[PDB]
From a paper:
Ferredoxins (FDXs) are small, ubiquitous proteins that typically contain iron-sulfur clusters and mediate electron shuttling among multiple metabolic pathways. The green alga Chlamydomonas reinhardtii (Chlamydomonas throughout) contains six genes that encode for chloroplast-localized ferredoxins. These proteins have been categorized into three separate groups, according to the plant nomenclature: FDX1 and FDX5 belong to the photosynthetic category (or leaf type), FDX2 belong to the non-photosynthetic group (or root type), and FDX3, FDX4, and FDX6 are divergent, being more closely related to bacterial FDXs. CrFDX2 amino acid sequence is highly homologous to that of CrFDX1 (67 % identity for the mature proteins), and it contains conserved residues that are known to be important for interactions with CrFDX1 enzyme targets.
Here we report the first 3D structure of a Chlamydomonas ferredoxin, CrFDX2, at atomic resolution of 1.18 Å. There is only one molecule in the asymmetric unit in complex with the [2Fe2S] cluster, and it shows a typical ferredoxin fold with a β-sheet formed by five β-strands covered by a single α-helix. The [2Fe2S] cluster of CrFDX2 is coordinated by four cysteine residues: Cys38, Cys 43, Cys 46, and Cys 76 (the numbering differs from that in Fig. 3 by 1, due to the lack of M at the start of each recombinant protein sequence). Furthermore, CrFDX2 shares a practically identical protein backbone with the leaf-type CfFDX1 indicating that both FDX types would be expected to share the same binding interface with CrHYDA1/CrFNR1. We specifically focused on two amino acids located near the electron acceptor site of FDX1, namely F62 and Y95:.
Residue numbers in the entry: 1 to 104
The structure:
Amino acid sequence: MFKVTFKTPKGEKTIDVEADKYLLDAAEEAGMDLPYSCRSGGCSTCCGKLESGTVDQSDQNMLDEDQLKQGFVLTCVAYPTSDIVILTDQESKLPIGGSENLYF
Ligand code: FES
């Protein structure tokens, strides 16, 4: 199965994840209470960030192309597609942005 290293605030561990199991679910089953809210791809609570490897997160409904290229992942709807190293609890890192903060 793929091996996924989850790097959390409280430590790291590496676990098996099947191709048809979402990251969040695997992590929870291995004792890691990762953040989540909606569990359906429509918020940023579960965001993680890929150090290495790939996911299938086609049901994600938050992230733009930039953000995807930066390795952001909605862990509640992400299947592994390779061995992975992922940082959890990364929502701070996602810029708020908006139409009133245009950075000049
Ligand atoms: S918990 Fe809302 S997108 Fe994952």
